[PDB]
Amino acid sequence: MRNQELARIFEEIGLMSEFLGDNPFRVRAYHQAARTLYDLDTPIEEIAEKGKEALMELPGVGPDLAEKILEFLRTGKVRKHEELSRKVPRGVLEVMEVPGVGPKTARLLYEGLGIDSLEKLKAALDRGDLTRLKGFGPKRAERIREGLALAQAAGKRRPLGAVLSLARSLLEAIRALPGVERAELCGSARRYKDTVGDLDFLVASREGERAVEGFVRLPQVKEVYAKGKERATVFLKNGLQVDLRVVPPESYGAGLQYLTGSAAHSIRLRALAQEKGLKLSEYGVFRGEKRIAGETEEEVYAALGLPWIPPPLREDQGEVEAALEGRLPKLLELPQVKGDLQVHSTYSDGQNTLEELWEAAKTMGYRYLAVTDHSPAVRVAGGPSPEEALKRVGEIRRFNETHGPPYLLAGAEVDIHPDGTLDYPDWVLRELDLVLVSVHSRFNLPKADQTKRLLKALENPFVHVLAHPTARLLGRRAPIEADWEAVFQKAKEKGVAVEIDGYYDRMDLPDDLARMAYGMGLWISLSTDAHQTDHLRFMELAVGTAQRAWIGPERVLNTLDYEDLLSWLKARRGV
């Protein structure tokens, strides 16, 4: 559909027209045309095919607008929009759209103050320049600064784990709206993508317009950006940018599929539908005018002749073909994970004692937890020394002797020196239950040198896991450059697992490299890199990553029970 694209075009024409000081009647008309297109559920092209008169039946559309609709459908553009674009630059249009600014103010700001950009706008805000205009007080001042921040965030992405719990708190409030029967967090978040744009929620309701009203008036909501009969876009007090879509309860499953995407996955499904005489839309699966499916997502997949496809797979990267042949991959599931294989403690940089870690693991129903404190070079500190590291092993063993399950594995996260040697001697490594190795320095070695360093680390027969291999920090540090094929192949041959560290701003291995490692036949270790017990919740992110990477419970260390895990760790591994 081109409905939303055209709604935007007319809205922009309205804004630019008002900026230029066109007829307020014409300005309001463009905005009403925009609302109509925003709310219109049927494709605008289907009405356009019926003719100019049919377009004019729509609320707000007259002879002028109907010709512009046809122009857009025939050429892909509207010359009027292009004409106003010649008179109104992009930066000045960006300024006017900030909440609390608007077209007329933007004109004064353009002509009198020299503000043609968000940059200048922020400069003015920060210096108090705007306070020297009539109509400007601390209330409007606060709105404009915040509007600017929201504008600048809308381009950008945040780690999934930075926003998922906040999204779930909003989901609770949405579910609690009277009139809402079901709701779900959809979009890329439901697919467990490691960074997300806006958050998208689907609601089932028989009273959609009233559900939208309740939603936009939730205590959590700060600003409404767009609102109509069945959808809204808002900004929360906590910053989150959120889209809502409402469908009738009979359509909920089709709405879930629609709003979960990816868009590429949905293109595949719509073609499969039409190839068997059906139409898939947000509202259901239809044979002619008759709705034959829609209430549940599994019913929708079934109507297309498919098994239900897990959301993390829905990227058009082989899942449609696998579903068509009745051979979807077996995927790791969160209940199958029996422990977390990288947690830190007060022996190094963690906030928790052994007792606190044990208690948290016991609450979670884990069989074990690996306490993997840093070697001295990681912390850029003096210790723990090799002697202290061994003393700690004895303490963890005594803790297990006095506590029982969940058992603590006495581990370490051992720094890899620039030359590929390890930051504990073999007499420490051999006594550890679990040896992780990782890069914490010299992140920018030439690719060939970084590769050699990692290969040399993997020579050591006491190593079990390559921890957070790329060392990336989302928003702070790029992945290290290394030949991952060479690194993974050596790890496979040596019996060393690669880690998926689900700590929210690590997400390392990323899904794509995890998919590569698992496809090459490696073992996988999941962890949260916890430094406080609240971090243990990130295991869901590591599992979601595994699912995106087509990883099953086979060759995942965390699906082994304690005895089987210790056996794996002690075994002659590799070729």
Question: Is 188 one of the annotated binding-site residues?
Answer: yes
196 near ligand DGT, rule: CB under 6 A: yes
DSSP 132: G
Query: Cβ distance 160 to 194 under 8 Å?
Result: yes
Residue 239 to residue 153: CA distance in whole angstroms:
9
198 near Ca ion, rule: CB under 5 A: yes
**Residue 523 has which token pair?**
């073992």
Contact string 250-289 vs Cl ion (x = CB under 5 A): ---x------------------------------------
Query: Cβ distance 560 to 338 under 8 Å?
Result: yes
Could you say which of ligand DGT, Cl ion, Ca ion, none residue 297 binds, taking C-beta under 5 to 8 angstroms by partner kind?
A: Cl ion
- Interface of this chain with Zn ion, residues 404 to 443, rule: CB under 5 A: 438
- Phi-psi sector, 519: left (phi>0), alpha (psi -120 to 50), beta: alpha
Give the DSSP per-residue string, 320-347. Answer: HHHHHTT-PPP---GGG--EEEEE--TT
Q: Is the peptide bond before 85 cis (omega within 30 degrees of 0)?
A: no
**Residue 572 has which token pair?**
């002659």
- Phi-psi sector, 186: left (phi>0), alpha (psi -120 to 50), beta: beta
Could you say which of Ca ion, Cl ion, ligand DGT, none residue 263 binds, taking C-beta under 5 to 8 angstroms by partner kind?
A: ligand DGT
- Interface of this chain with Cl ion, residues 113 to 142, rule: CB under 5 A: none
In whole angstroms, the minimum distance from the beta carbon of 148 to Zn ion comes to 36
C-alpha closest to that of 556 among 518, 501, 516, 510: 518
3-state secondary structure of 541: helix
512 near ligand DGT, rule: CB under 6 A: no
3-state secondary structure of 572: coil
184 near Cl ion, rule: CB under 5 A: no
Q: What are phi and psi of 58, to 5 degrees?
A: -65, 140
**Residue 128 has which token pair?**
């108090």
**Residue 7 has which token pair?**
């709604």
Give the DSSP per-residue string, 475-496. Answer: TTBPPPP--HHHHHHHHHHHT-
C-alpha closest to that of 424 among 458, 393, 384: 384
Residue 505 to residue 159: CA distance in whole angstroms:
6
Contact string 170-189 vs Ca ion (x = CB under 5 A): ----------x------x--
248 near ligand DGT, rule: CB under 6 A: no
- Pairing assessment for the beta strands 241-247 and 231-236 based on DSSP bridges: antiparallel
Contact string 237-256 vs Ca ion (x = CB under 5 A): ------x-------------
Specify the residue, 39 or 349, whose C-beta has the smaller distance to Zn ion.
Answer: 349
- Of the residues 85, 296, 346, 351, which one makes contact with Cl ion according to CB under 5 A: 296
Residue of this chain nearest to ligand DGT (CB atom): 261
Could you say which of Cl ion, Ca ion, Zn ion, none residue 198 binds, taking C-beta under 5 to 8 angstroms by partner kind?
A: Ca ion
Could you say which of Ca ion, Cl ion, Zn ion, none residue 253 binds, taking C-beta under 5 to 8 angstroms by partner kind?
A: Cl ion
Report how many residues bind Zn ion under the rule CB under 5 A. 1
- Of the residues 169, 262, 351, 421, which one makes contact with ligand DGT according to CB under 6 A: 262
- Of the residues 187, 294, 502, 544, which one makes contact with ligand DGT according to CB under 6 A: 187
In whole angstroms, the minimum distance from the beta carbon of 107 to Zn ion comes to 54
Specify the residue, 26 or 291, whose C-beta has the smaller distance to Ca ion.
Answer: 26
Question: Is 349 one of the annotated binding-site residues?
Answer: yes
Residues that bind ligand DGT (CB under 6 A): 187-188, 193, 196-198, 200, 258-263, 266
List, as residue ranges, the binding site for Mg(2+): 198, 200, 243
Residues that bind Ca ion (CB under 5 A): 56, 61, 180, 187, 197-198, 200, 243
Residues that bind Zn ion (CB under 5 A): 438
